[PDB]
């Protein structure tokens, strides 16, 4: 049921049966979030979830791709993800295609680019932590002294966090390690997206598009306030289908909206199963 980074949500039969759906975790969550979707897919659809690993998006896909091949061979591959999971699913479709495997479906559940690129600069690192420090002033009713920008500016996202957590530990506050893990992993996993090196894909992608990012995403990164109609994918994906679903990014994975995703996806899986049979 949990084997390394692979969660079994519905086991495939010992032999034969329908094409599995591989789902990839969101930042801060596990693949149990795909249970509602599973309920709106056809009976006996197998489903396996890929849980977090470390590295860049490319490095994470380098860990997943071998495991995908161990599980499902030449194909067909059906890859699905919400939020960061959608970025991970796509990265896997690229890795699999370079190895000549047969990718038939890539379903992105509101995996939408920031409305403009997030600069990877020292100035942007300073601005981002100034915003974060101001929120923390308000929230924890404190004054924050001068941020040690020289220190933070040379560190990766991970380093920036551990530095900030070492400095919070330093004075006063002892945080439950479970709270720290959860906040640190959510934060780093969502930041890994900003430097994804998106490659062109030659197959069909389906983007389930909500109306907007929710407020906490915008707080994390204000460029999520704007989105383009193709969610940023059009330059990389010639064969791009968008399925508007409405609502907010945070709601897209849950009932009732997931009913709309599953209905559409069920027809795509049906077509795939007919094309083999």
Ligand X SMILES: COc1ccc(-c2noc(C(=O)NCCc3ccc(C(=O)N4CCC4)cc3)n2)cc1OC
Q: Provide the binding-site residues for ligand X, judged by CB under 6 A.
A: 83-84, 86-87, 111-113, 186, 190, 193, 196, 198, 216-217, 220, 224, 232-233, 249
Nearest CB to ligand X, comparing residues 101 and 113: 113
- SS3 label, residue 113: coil
Rounded CA-CA distance 264/107 in Å is 10
Q: In what order do the strands lie in the sheet with 21-24?
A: 2-3, 6-10, 47-50, 21-24, 77-82, 103-109, 205-209, 240-244
Nearest CB to ligand X, comparing residues 53 and 198: 198
Q: Least distance (Å) from ligand X to the CB of residue 183?
A: 8
Strand residue runs (E) in 12-76: 21-24, 47-50
SS3 assignment for 64-82? HHHHHHHHHCCCCEEEEEE
Q: Least distance (Å) from ligand X to the CB of residue 13?
A: 33
Q: Least distance (Å) from ligand X to the CB of residue 248?
A: 10
Nearest CB to ligand X, comparing residues 6 and 111: 111
- Residues with a catalytic annotation lie at 83
Q: Least distance (Å) from ligand X to the CB of residue 191?
A: 9
Nearest CB to ligand X, comparing residues 71 and 219: 219
Q: Which residue is nearest to ligand X (CB)?
A: 111
- SS3 label, residue 56: coil
């Amino acid at each position: 049921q949990i084997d390394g980074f692979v969660r079994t949500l519905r086991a495939r039969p010992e032999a034969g049966g329908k094409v599995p759906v591989f789902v990839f975790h969101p930042a801060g969550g596990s693949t149990v979030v795909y249970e509602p979707l599973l309920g709106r897919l056809p009976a006996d659809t197998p489903m396996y979830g890929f849980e977090r690993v470390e590295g860049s998006i490319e490095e994470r896909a380098q860990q997943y791709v071998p495991k995908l091949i161990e599980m499902q061979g030449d194909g067909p591959y059906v890859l699905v993800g919400w939020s960061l999971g959608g970025v991970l699913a796509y990265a896997c479709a690229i890795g699999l295609r370079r190895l000549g495997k047969d990718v038939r479906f890539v379903g992105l559940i509101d995996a939408v680019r920031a409305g403009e690129e997030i600069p990877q600069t020292k100035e942007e690192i300073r601005k981002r932590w100034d915003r974060y420090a101001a929120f923390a002033e308000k929230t924890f009713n404190v004054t924050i002294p001068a941020i040690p920008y020289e220190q933070l500016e040379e560190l990766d996202d991970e380093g920036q966090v551990r530095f900030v957590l070492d400095a919070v530990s330093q004075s006063g506050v002892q945080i439950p390690a479970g709270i720290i893990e959860h906040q640190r992993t959510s934060y780093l996993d969502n930041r890994a997206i900003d430097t994804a090196q998106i490659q062109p894909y030659d197959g069909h992608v389906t983007l389930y598009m909500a109306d907007r990012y929710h407020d906490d995403a915008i707080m994390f990164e204000p460029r999520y306030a704007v989105r383009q109609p193709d969610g940023g994918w059009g330059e990389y994906v010639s064969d791009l289908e968008v399925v508007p679903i409405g609502g907010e990014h945070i709601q897209a994975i849950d009932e009732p909206i997931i009913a709309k995703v599953g209905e559409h996806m069920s027809r795509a899986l049906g077509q795939i199963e007919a094309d083999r049979t």
